[PDB]
């Protein structure tokens, strides 16, 4: 039972209490919006190739707009994930620093003193430098 843990509860704690709502929503909004364009550019190409095989018109500007929308959305999605990942990483570390400092010395003596270190060096590194990617 301990090993069997899909861990959807840990994702909620990260996003809600550390990321925010403006930045979290734009991350989800951009992802769905980016792949909606990715379908459209392929779909519009099929209609272009199928119909142009001799109403109808020349698709010399519409396909550019879908590509232009897709290229810009790639920049938006890439920035938002990394910017939000930065915000979570920085503010989580401040919360951990403000807790251990304002903590009783009884827990420090009882703890192996490596549990705090691991959750401070190894764990903070994975959250800071891997989750955004």
């Amino acid at each position: 039972l301990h090993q069997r843990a899909k861990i959807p509860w840990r994702a909620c704690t990260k996003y809600l209490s550390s990321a925010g709502i403006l930045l979290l929503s734009l991350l989800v909004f951009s992802q769905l919006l980016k792949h909606m364009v990715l379908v459209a550019i392929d779909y519009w190409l099929a209609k272009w190739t199928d119909s142009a095989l001799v109403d109808q018109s020349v698709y010399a500007m519409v396909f550019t707009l879908l590509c232009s929308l897709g290229i810009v959305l790639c920049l938006v999605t890439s920035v938002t994930v990394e910017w939000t990942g930065l915000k979570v990483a920085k503010r989580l570390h401040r919360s951990l620093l403000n807790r251990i400092i304002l903590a009783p010395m009884r827990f420090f003596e009882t703890t192996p003193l490596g549990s705090i270190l691991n959750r401070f060096s190894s764990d903070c590194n994975t959250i800071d430098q891997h989750i955004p990617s």
Binding site: K6, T13, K14, L96, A103, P104, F107, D123, T126, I127
Partner: protein, 292 residues
């Protein structure tokens, strides 16, 4: 699109597995944030109601008992030993019951306090926690020093701009070591005592005592040091008793603590024997037999 499904399915499962392990790091970090303790507050007005700085040190213990694990298996039972305000008093215990319980109770570090304490006549639980430890000097067993500027080492919290600390630096102890650092007052530390005088911990408290207005002095045991180091502590104790008028030394070296007004010891979970003078300890040769 059917061609690209093969690696979309692969990297969907692959990244998911790699994310779950990294999400476990969020689980473990957030578990430490669930250790909500160390309530820093005061159940009274802390601005002017408490004393600005305890000077008399008239702390008369009244049925206070300290136990760590949820007030279980206490090493003290209704500890009521009257210290001497306005004069030095050195109480040394053979075992850890005398000093371990006392040191925690002075600074409220003890997990449980069954009773109450009267700091300079004012209650302890109704006072700011930072001010409690700001004006109560104490030495430790092992030498502990950090790596940082000396001007931000002796009084980082006080941030006193007085140059008397530099004058005290070459006067309190290690006159040559001060010259060894070209910076002096503003000099930074060097590898945290990798090669430094053994009296650094005691010297640091000397600057802390003079700057932080530490009228009351606390002590602990010693691991290993020179014999003359104890003699230097004696001179500071005399100055502390003459000027600060409050001192409470706890150790297991009988002869050093003998030069004090009183002496006490708590044993077997309670108080063992209290003596108003210090020669009364020598009157009972049994306790001197245990010491040597």
């Amino acid at each position: 699109y059917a061609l690209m499904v093969s690696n979309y399915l692969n990297w969907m499962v692959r990244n998911l597995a790699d994310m779950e392990i990294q999400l476990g790091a969020v689980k473990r970090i957030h578990a430490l944030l669930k250790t909500e303790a160390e309530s820093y507050e005061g159940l009274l007005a802390p601005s002017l109601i408490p004393k600005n700085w305890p000077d008399q040190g008239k702390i008369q213990i009244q049925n206070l008992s300290v136990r760590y694990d949820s007030s279980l298996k206490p090493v003290l039972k209704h500890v009521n030993t009257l210290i001497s305000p306005g004069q030095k008093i050195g109480i040394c215990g053979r075992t850890g019951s005398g000093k371990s319980s006392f040191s925690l109770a002075f600074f409220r570090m003890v997990d449980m306090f069954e009773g109450r304490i009267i700091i300079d006549g004012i209650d302890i639980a109704k006072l700011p926690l930072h001010t409690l430890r700001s004006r109560l000097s104490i030495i430790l067993q092992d030498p502990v020093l950090f790596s940082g500027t000396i001007r931000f080492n002796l009084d980082p919290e006080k941030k006193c701009s007085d140059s008397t600390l530099w004058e005290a630096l070459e006067i309190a102890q290690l006159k040559l070591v001060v010259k060894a650092l070209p910076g002096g007052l503003d000099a930074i530390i060097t590898e945290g005592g990798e090669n430094f005088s053994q009296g650094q911990r005691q010297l640091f408290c000397l600057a802390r005592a003079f700057v932080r207005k530490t009228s009351i002095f606390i002590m602990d045991e010693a691991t290993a040091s020179i014999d003359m180091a104890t003699e230097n502590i004696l001179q500071k104790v005399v100055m502390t008793a003459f000027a600060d008028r409050t001192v409470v030394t706890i150790a297991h070296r009988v002869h050093t603590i003998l030069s004090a007004d009183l002496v006490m010891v708590l044993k077997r979970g309670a108080i063992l024997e209290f003596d108003k003078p210090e020669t009364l300890l020598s009157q009972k040769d049994s306790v001197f037999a245990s010491f040597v």
